[PDB]
Amino acid sequence: GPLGSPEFAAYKVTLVTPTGNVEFQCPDDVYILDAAEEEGIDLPFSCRAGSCSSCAGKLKTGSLNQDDQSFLDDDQIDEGWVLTCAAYPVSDVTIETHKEEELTA
Ligand code: FES
């Protein structure tokens, strides 16, 4: 049977930062953090490899692929936690950024 998904897409990312919102378009094959930086948004990061808490966020709406991350356990992923350096949007998304301090490990 046929495939439904587009080869390419642009997804609107809304970041809810601690004090404001900023928005930009993100290609389907660009990580949230990278697309934000391309727009000059200064988001926290360190390893950029999915294995730490620096870039943590929380997904409020939409859907993300986070198969490339490793530090968050499956339950944390199910509970909405995001490593923005290793997440791809598969829809328009709203993500709260700067959420490192809310994690445990
Ligand atoms: S910066 Fe370490 S997991 Fe994203």
Numbering used by the authors: -7 to 97
Quote what the paper states about this structure.
The noncanonical amino acid, para‐cyanophenylalanine (CNF), when incorporated into metalloproteins, functions as an infrared spectroscopic probe for the redox state of iron‐sulfur clusters, offering a strategy for determining electron occupancy in the electron transport chains of complex metalloenzymes. In conclusion, we have incorporated the noncanonical amino acid, CNF, into two FeS proteins, and in each case observed a small, reproducible shift (<2 cm−1) in the nitrile stretching band of CNF following cluster reduction and re‐oxidation, which is consistent with an electric field effect from proximity to the cluster(s) in different redox states. We also obtained high‐resolution crystal structures of CNF‐labeled proteins in both the oxidized and reduced states, demonstrating that site‐specific placement of CNF caused minimal structural perturbation, and giving a precise location for the CNF side chain in each protein. These investigations lay the foundation for employing site‐specifically incorporated CNF to probe the redox state of FeS cluster‐containing proteins by IR spectroscopy.
We first selected spinach ferredoxin I (FdI) and incorporated CNF close to the [2Fe–2S] cluster. Mutation of Tyr in position 37 (Y37) gave protein variants with equivalent UV–visible spectra and cluster reduction potentials to the WT FdI, while variants at other sites gave abnormal spectral features. The IR spectra of Y37CNF FdI in the as‐isolated state in solution show a low‐intensity but clear nitrile stretching band at 2236.2 cm−1 (top) close to that of free CNF measured in the same buffer solution (2237 cm−1). We then applied electrochemical control to the solution of Y37CNF FdI in an IR spectro‐electrochemical cell, Figure 1A (middle and bottom). At −5 mV, the spectrum exactly resembled the as‐isolated protein, while at −650 mV, a redshift of 1.7 cm−1 was observed in the band from CNF. Crystal structures of WT FdI and variant Y37CNF were solved at near‐atomic resolution for both oxidized and reduced states of the protein. Site‐specific replacement of tyrosine with CNF causes a small change in conformation of the side chain relative to the native enzyme. This shift is sufficient to alter the crystal packing, placing the CNF side chain in a slightly different environment within the lattice relative to the native Tyr, however, comparison of the structures of oxidized and reduced Y37CNF FdI demonstrates that the redox state of Fe does not influence the geometry of the side chain relative to the [2Fe–2S] cluster position.
